[PDB]
């Protein structure tokens, strides 16, 4: 089957054939539509055919479909897992597959740049201190000194589901979160359960409003440990605003490197539970969300009051005007410093012509229309008025229940 | 099969029962989702028919009554031997009501039982549909104190005899593709005016031209008429701080009337139905002004603010748009001509999911186009998790009647 899509902005119409290759299911069905949903132990049974499926993909990509060394890697993969019930990836074929796993991402607006990732294989990582180097050299690797280079850590699959290795953390560098007893929040909201997850592993906490929060890391399925980033590698950035000079009095920074380590990363079937991969941002991840959303640090009124806007009505629309303004220092600030950021403008541009160029090259570009539309300034961006096709294609990026919720502890 | 929906900011988790009421189908599978696409016989009739008056009588505690019994009798009977049937005047706004209430794109349904219905099912020809949607304008407009209206014209009968209004909205600007290659008035109304022309219309060629109404009735030939330009409210947009605003020579209309729908009530299809409830700002400030193919003049008003356009970085796009949606809201409250900001219409669309879904068990919902096209994460709805299905009575889209007639 062919399925279309049109831009209703530019009349270009494409074609997906793409879709035809999907083989998970989206939550939708013929009788309702689970789009705006967010969130909507394996057998050799099952696994043969998921890493015969993948292998195909893997030597059709290298021009080497059905070749002699393609039916001796599918003969030896077969003989490993009904001998062992599993089997290992080729180094070749794990950067192959995470690479693919970001380009087949519906929800991620950077993926033009899907090709340019670079791997750490840490499948020989046996323990959490072992974990702590292995993300330590992530860190510094994927900062650059602010010249960000995507990345991704891939420690060792899952087994029986007994001895997962986990990142406790959802993301590497975070804000720590503190619930007061008051009912009021110091710090990000987000992240107050694992900050009390922390503290009660022993973390001391500065209590500050942004602390850095330190690493929770599981290996083989043994309990989680703590360890602190070297503060030395974490590269926070002021924010500042080109025109208001109050703005720095607000007293706000952000973190330049987005790291995100609670995704599973699914390859031929096998499960890698603890996968951390960097990118650079957005700037609305941190401008609209981090900073705006009423669950985050909310600072929009704050904001508006010290511009003097008009707060008594909504249709003075102060929150979409103290929004921008919050936009703007956040970029100035990246910029200035000399740290990778992107704006939406820039990045939702960037995904139209990776988006048409993938249909062209691939035959489709399975896309959340829900995520991909950024959170400030919808219309004025392309991808609003791109119609979008989403499907699920592996190799994948899945959610996975956090670890707390499932850890079976050693004591 | 019971399906929950979170809201992520306040943890309100609510339970959906009535999809499983729906029946039409969305476009999606289980291997693909579509919520992107905007497009995805006597023995058809009587299930629809009864589906219809089963809901209806339920609605007014008489189920499995006499004269819930005796009506679907009735309407068999009619049926067998018309082909088709007649709603009672009852049943005709009930449906027409819940047409609105079930339309998911619809950000206002807070309102949807206060529509005041004109059943123009006596129409017969193209002057007397002029004169009751002059009336459906005048009623609606009400001085600028707007209210949410819909006219009826009579119901498909074998598809020759089709009532059409072929305007897409009962006001809209004229669009003239010029010789210097540009577009004059809104691009997005082109092509219906060149058959604005070809029929007879006299175009004054100007930015910010009313279009005449062409009214089809009974299947016949569409007929041209101007709505008289005393009931065509209009709102000179001007900025609170910049007095540089008004000279960019900007206005719009205060009545959004869609008029190209079909309303489907019990199996029967109204071709003809056009609504109107008032705007909400964006409508005009972020898609019907800055839109690229429609007036697009974010870059004349980026140079009037003096803003550094080199670099989008700046966000110069960004600070003119929320400049124009504040001049927008000012100049339809100063002329005070009802208008909603969208903060206060998620807000209360908020409030009304709740209430459906405490009263009715769930709210059809697209969140592709319940998020206003500005500010979304800073409005709840943008946290809101919306289950998109289809519930009838319903509004649905139909084909531009210039392809499907013959002349
Ligand atoms: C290099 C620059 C990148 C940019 C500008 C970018 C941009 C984004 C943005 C804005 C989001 C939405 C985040 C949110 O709203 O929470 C996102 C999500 C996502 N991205 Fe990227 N990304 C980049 C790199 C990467 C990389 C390196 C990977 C994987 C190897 C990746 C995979 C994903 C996945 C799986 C999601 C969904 C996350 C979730 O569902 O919570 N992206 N991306
Ligand atoms: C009274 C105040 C109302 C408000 C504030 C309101 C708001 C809106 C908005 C913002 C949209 C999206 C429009 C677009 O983006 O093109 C919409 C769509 C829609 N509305 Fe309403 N509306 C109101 C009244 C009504 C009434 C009275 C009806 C029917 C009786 C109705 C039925 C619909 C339908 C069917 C759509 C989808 C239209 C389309 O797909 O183009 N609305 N509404
Ligand atoms: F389905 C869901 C339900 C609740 C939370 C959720 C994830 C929320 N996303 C927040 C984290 N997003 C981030 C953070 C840092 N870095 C990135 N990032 C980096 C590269 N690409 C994305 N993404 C999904
Ligand atoms: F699926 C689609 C394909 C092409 C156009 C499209 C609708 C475009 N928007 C026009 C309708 N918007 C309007 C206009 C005036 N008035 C209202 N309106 C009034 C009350 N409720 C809505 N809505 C859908
Ligand atoms: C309910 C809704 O699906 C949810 O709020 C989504 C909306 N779109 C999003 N888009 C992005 N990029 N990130 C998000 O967290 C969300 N949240
Ligand atoms: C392609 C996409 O579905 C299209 O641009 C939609 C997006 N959301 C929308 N939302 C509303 N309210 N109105 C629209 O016309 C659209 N257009
Ligand atoms: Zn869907």
Redesign the pocket.
């Known amino acids: 089957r062919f399925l279309k899509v049109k831009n209703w902005e530019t009349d270009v119409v494409l074609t997906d054939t793409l879709h035809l290759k999907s083989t998970l299911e989206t939550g939708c069905t013929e009788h309702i539509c689970m789009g705006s949903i967010?969130?909507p132990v394996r057998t050799k049974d099952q696994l043969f055919p998921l890493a015969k499926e993948f292998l195909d993909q893997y030597y059709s990509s290298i021009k080497r479909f059905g070749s002699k060394a393609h039916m001796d890697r599918l003969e030896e993969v077969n003989k490993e897992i009904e001998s062992t019930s599993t089997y290992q990836l080729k180094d070749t074929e794990l950067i192959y597959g995470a690479k693919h796993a970001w380009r087949n991402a519906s929800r991620?607006v950077?993926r033009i740049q899907w090709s340019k990732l670079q791997v750490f294989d840490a499948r020989d990582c046996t323990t959490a201190h072992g974990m702590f180097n292995y993300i330590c050299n992530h860190v510094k690797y994927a900062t650059n000194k602010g010249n960000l280079r995507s990345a991704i850590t891939i420690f060792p699959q899952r087994t029986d589901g007994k001895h997962d290795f986990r990142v406790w953390n959802?993301?590497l560098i975070r804000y720590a979160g503190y619930k007061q007893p008051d009912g009021s929040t110091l710090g990000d909201p987000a992240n107050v359960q694992f900050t009390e997850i922390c503290i009660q592993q022993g973390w001391k906490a500065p209590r500050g409003r942004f602390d850095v929060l330190p690493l929770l890391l599981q290996a083989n399925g043994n309990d989680p440990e703590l360890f602190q980033i070297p503060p030395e590698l974490v590269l926070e950035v002021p924010i500042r605003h080109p025109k208001f000079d109050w703005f720095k009095d607000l007293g706000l920074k952000w973190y330049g490197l987005?790291?995100?380590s609670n995704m599973l990363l699914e390859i031929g079937g096998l499960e890698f539970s603890a996968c951390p991969?960097?990118?650079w941002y957005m700037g609305t991840?941190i401008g609209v969300r981090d900073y705006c959303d009423n669950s985050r640090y909310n600072i929009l009124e704050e904001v508006a009051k010290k511009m003097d806007l008009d707060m008594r009505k909504t249709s003075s629309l102060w929150k979409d005007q103290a929004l921008v303004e919050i936009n703007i220092a956040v970029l100035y600030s990246f910029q200035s410093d000399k740290v990778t950021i992107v704006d939406h403008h820039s990045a939702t541009e960037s995904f139209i012509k990776h988006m048409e160029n993938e249909y062209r090259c691939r035959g489709g570009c399975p896309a959340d229309w829900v995520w991909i539309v950024p959170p400030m300034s919808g219309s004025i961006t392309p991808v609003f008025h791109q119609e979008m096709l989403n499907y699920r294609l592996t190799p994948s990026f899945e959610?996975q229940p956090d670890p707390w919720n499932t850890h079976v502890w050693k004591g």
Do not use: K, N
Request: aromatic share 14%; net charge negative; hydrophobic share 35%.
């Open positions: 967010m969130l991620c950077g959802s993301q987005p790291a995100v991969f960097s990118g991840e959610y």
